[PDB]
Design a protein around this nucleic acid. Structure first.
Ligand SMILES: [K+]
Ligand SMILES: [K+]
Ligand SMILES: [Mg+2]
Ligand SMILES: [Mg+2]
Ligand SMILES: [Mg+2]
Ligand SMILES: [Mg+2]
Ligand SMILES: [Mg+2]
Ligand SMILES: [Mg+2]
Ligand SMILES: [Mg+2]
Ligand SMILES: [Mg+2]
Ligand SMILES: [Mg+2]
Ligand SMILES: [Mg+2]
Ligand SMILES: [Mg+2]
Ligand SMILES: [Mg+2]
Ligand SMILES: [Mg+2]
Ligand SMILES: [Mg+2]
Ligand SMILES: [Mg+2]
Ligand SMILES: [Mg+2]
Ligand SMILES: [Mg+2]
Ligand SMILES: [Mg+2]
Ligand SMILES: [Mg+2]
Ligand SMILES: [Mg+2]
Ligand SMILES: [Mg+2]
Ligand SMILES: [Mg+2]
Ligand SMILES: [Mg+2]
Ligand SMILES: [Mg+2]
Ligand SMILES: [Zn+2]
Lengths: 155, 125, 98, 60, 127, 80, 24
RNA sequence: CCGGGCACUCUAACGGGACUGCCCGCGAAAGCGGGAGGAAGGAGGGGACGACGUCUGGUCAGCAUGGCCCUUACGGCCUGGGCGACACACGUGCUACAAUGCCCACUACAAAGCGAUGCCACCCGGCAACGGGGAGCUAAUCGCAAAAAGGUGGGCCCAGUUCGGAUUGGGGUCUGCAACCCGACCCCAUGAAGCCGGAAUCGCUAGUAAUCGCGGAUCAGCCAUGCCGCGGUGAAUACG
């Protein structure tokens, strides 16, 4: 992107919750364009969070995401023969991106054999404040901050 | 249940369990459990003596397996080997015996690589 | 009630040939089935542009064969006359069955 | 295209197999088309001249 | 009595015949759900009706050929969208803003020579 | 996994030149270029010189090799 | 996988037929 | 399916359509941002097309060509061999290491193409490859042709395992004068490495990437998992 600033693709609201953030999460889950297989996985998970929990799946979702968003991160830079982890605030658009990506990433690290279960648990497990997705989010924030000395390199 | 020579498959569907025999494969396994009428899906642990005996009987008295197979096969390779035969040569030298390239690949029959020295001048790629 | 086939390489050589027939026998036979456009069968040739190596250039050539029908019913007497031997197009070929 | 080798035209193959094509224009044996009896080179050439009826430059 | 449209998507056309009724939908002689057997996408197809509170005042007989299921899903979406305005031009006013009346032009891009498939370019080493 | 079908091929060049050499007993050497030919029963005991592409190689054909081809015994390439 | 000639995909990939993929 | 009808879908020729024309805002203009109507909006998407010139780039082995050189041989013919060697090294790819998966059923939904001594329906024989018989098509009309991914049901239960299909032993089928060197294919047995890959490095900005299958040229057959096209499902991201 050297000329313009690329406008963000606007997604199609969820087939069930009419939410755009859901389509995203689904997309991230999807691999090899198997959007059907993807969608189902998320949904089955929604029904799994619906059981083991009394709270609505949609709301559990929102929360987890919110909990896994990083508000700070270190972006490496060159300064007179040396690379520095420069803490940088994190763009809202990028937060949602990193959050959704991480959940799925962490989710597939889990031990439970069934996909939907892994998403299910990771998701609810996230809204609880725990889970590997949230640990990544924290390690990142710990990374930033911990280099506040190189913060004057605003970037 | 020990069927073929000291062969003990168990705790799995008899069809696959039967697979653990040298000379038996999905094909033959699916056969014996037919010509012997035995739900192939049953676990070896849940088999019945009547069945476990029929299996043994059929399979053992109907095919050349385990020690025998290994022996015959061995005999065969030694055969084309003893006689002049080209395949014999390839078995000797230990190289592929079915018209494959030995310039690259052919690792399965050559084993690990025995790297040496060469020429790193100009794009040798 | 005659069934005629019109194939070719030029799509204007056939239009100036199917109508070369219809209009003529359009005043001596049935009102005809009009000219019907049969789908085309394309023949592609893909060649490496240069004589030696350079297998990444290639140029594409196609030999498309167009088709027609017409089909006039009522094999009238005054029809096989306005037609018969008054041909014009040279890049065309014609088949006839009825 | 050694003249001696363009003897391919020689029906007498002894065994139908041994019979192979060759460019009818350059003798080129290596990439001859059937519908033209021409190799990819000669073919490209004549097509440019317009001497290959119906054959056009395909684009899509 | 009847209302037609067409709708085409990624090279898949569909006949959309609307008629006043319940909500019954015959697609190639099958129930909508009979044809779109468990394809989360399906719902979308009928979205144009829900848009104008219809569905509960209409019925539809659909014929479809060409392409693939999800492409057909969209063809139907456009057919049904056109037929609805065929029954009432005033439907555009609020049916259009949701796009429904636009034909998706994006189609399989051509496979170029030298590439592995349109854009994917061959991998090169020690350059 | 070998296979021809029905008609165990054999260049008659030597066949009708060996099945004949059976009548007057045996013989000593038969140099051939047809390594294509399948070895068969009535060859056992003989000695066929097969051309490997540079030379004709002596091959005492024995029972144990009655089904193989003649080339199989005249190795083409020379290695290490 | 596509390399297993004794499976459906095996046959399809190799564009052949047989026990593991007969012509309907 | 028949009668029947060209509405529709198509098939394929010819036209209409978009012009920053309209409205608002900014300019001095050209234009820029935005809004309407529109299938489409400001080069709508893809292609063909690549200036004067550079690399004494590539090709005397497509062909043409100046000059050299051989002219019972540096010409010509065969039969056989080699181009298919291997301690070893690299490029490009294919198939994988699995549960977002593998297997077996049942059932859907394409587009381009190719086919008269060629596609080959259907039937019988064979586990099958394929044999034998045989209808149809000069092919929008008959055949290749199954679409696969999907969807539905069932099995496997985390294991080098129902993952993976290398290698090897058998027994066969085709093409062909002939498959030892050196063919593809089928069936039984065998069931390797491989648990996601160091340093380093490639592609792609959307119907693109990633995935799934289909056709064609060459061609008897084939070593195509290569090329050249076709359509299905279909992302992520671009501060800068
Ligand atoms: K030059
Ligand atoms: K191995
Ligand atoms: Mg076994
Ligand atoms: Mg070799
Ligand atoms: Mg090439
Ligand atoms: Mg010459
Ligand atoms: Mg040939
Ligand atoms: Mg040729
Ligand atoms: Mg594609
Ligand atoms: Mg290439
Ligand atoms: Mg397998
Ligand atoms: Mg030079
Ligand atoms: Mg150079
Ligand atoms: Mg010269
Ligand atoms: Mg070579
Ligand atoms: Mg060596
Ligand atoms: Mg490859
Ligand atoms: Mg049968
Ligand atoms: Mg061979
Ligand atoms: Mg291991
Ligand atoms: Mg494992
Ligand atoms: Mg670009
Ligand atoms: Mg193919
Ligand atoms: Mg071929
Ligand atoms: Mg090979
Ligand atoms: Mg192929
Ligand atoms: Zn030529």
């Amino acid at each position: 992107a050297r000329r313009r600033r690329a406008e963000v693709r606007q997604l199609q609201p969820d087939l069930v919750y009419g939410d755009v953030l859901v389509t995203a999460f689904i997309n991230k889950i999807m691999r090899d364009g198997k959007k059907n297989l993807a969608a189902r996985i998320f949904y089955d998970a929604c029904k799994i969070i619906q059981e083991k929990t009394g709270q609505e799946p949609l709301k559990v979702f929102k929360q987890a995401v919110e909990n896994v968003k990083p508000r700070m991160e270190v972006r490496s830079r060159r300064v007179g023969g040396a690379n520095y982890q420069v803490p940088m605030e994190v763009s809202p658009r990028r937060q949602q991106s990193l959050a959704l990506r991480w959940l799925v990433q962490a989710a597939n690290q889990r031990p439970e054999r069934r996909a939907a279960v892994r998403i299910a648990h990771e998701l609810m497990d996230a809204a609880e404040g725990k889970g590997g997705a949230v640990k990544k989010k924290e390690d990142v924030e710990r990374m930033a901050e911990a280099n506040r000395a190189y913060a004057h390199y605003r970037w | 249940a020990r069927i073929a020579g000291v062969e003990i498959p168990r705790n799995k569907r008899v069809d696959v369990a039967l697979t653990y025999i040298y000379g038996i494969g999905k094909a033959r396994a699916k056969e014996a459990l037919e010509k012997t009428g035995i739900n192939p899906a049953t676990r070896v642990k849940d088999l019945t003596e009547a069945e476990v005996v029929r299996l043994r009987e059929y399979v053992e008295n109907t095919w050349k397996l385990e020690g025998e197979l290994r022996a015959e096969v061995a005999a065969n390779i030694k055969r084309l080997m003893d006689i002049g035969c080209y395949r014999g040569l390839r078995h000797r030298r230990g190289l592929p015996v079915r018209g494959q390239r030995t310039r690259t690949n052919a690792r399965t029959r050559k084993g690990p690589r025995k790297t040496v020295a060469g020429k790193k001048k100009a794009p040798r790629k | 009630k005659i069934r005629i086939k019109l194939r070719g390489f030029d799509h204007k050589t056939l239009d100036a040939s199917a109508q070369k027939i219809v209009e003529a026998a359009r005043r001596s036979g049935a009102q005809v089935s009009g000219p019907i456009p049969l789908p085309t069968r394309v023949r592609r040739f893909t060649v490496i542009r240069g004589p030696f190596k350079h297998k990444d250039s290639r140029e594409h050539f196609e030999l498309r064969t167009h088709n027609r029908l017409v089909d006039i019913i009522n094999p009238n007497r005054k029809t096989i006359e306005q037609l018969m031997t008054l041909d014009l197009p040279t890049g065309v070929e014609i088949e006839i069955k009825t | 295209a050694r003249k001696a080798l363009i003897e391919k035209a020689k029906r007498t193959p002894k065994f139908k197999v041994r019979a192979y094509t060759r460019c009818v224009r350059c003798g080129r044996a290596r990439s001859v088309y059937r519908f033209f009896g021409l190799c990819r080179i000669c073919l490209r050439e004549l097509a440019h001249k317009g001497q290959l009826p119906g054959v056009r430059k395909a684009s899509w | 009595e009847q209302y037609y449209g067409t709708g085409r998507r990624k090279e898949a056309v569909a006949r959309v015949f609307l008629r006043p009724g319940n909500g019954k939908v015959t697609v190639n002689g099958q129930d909508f759900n009979e044809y779109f057997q468990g394809l989360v996408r399906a719902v979308a197809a009928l979205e144009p009706l829900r848009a104008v509170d219809a569905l509960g005042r209409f019925d539809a007989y659909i014929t479809v050929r060409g392409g693939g299921k999800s492409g057909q899903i969209d063809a139907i979406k456009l057919g049904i969208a056109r037929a609805l305005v065929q029954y009432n031009p005033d439907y555009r006013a609020k049916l259009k803003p949701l796009g429904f009346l636009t034909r998706d032009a994006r189609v399989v891009e051509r496979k170029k020579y030298g590439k592995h498939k349109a854009r994917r370019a061959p991998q090169y080493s020690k350059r | 996994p070998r296979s021809l079908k029905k008609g165990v091929f054999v260049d008659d060049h030597l066949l009708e030149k060996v099945l004949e050499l059976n009548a007057k007993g045996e013989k000593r050497l038969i140099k051939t270029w047809s390594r294509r030919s399948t070895i068969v029963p009535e060859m056992v005991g003989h000695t066929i010189a097969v051309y490997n592409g540079k030379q004709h190689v002596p091959v005492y054909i024995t029972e144990n090799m009655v089904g193989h081809k003649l080339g199989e015994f005249a190795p083409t390439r020379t290695y290490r | 996988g596509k390399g297993d000639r004794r499976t459906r995909r095996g046959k399809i990939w190799r564009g052949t037929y047989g026990k593991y993929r007969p012509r309907k």
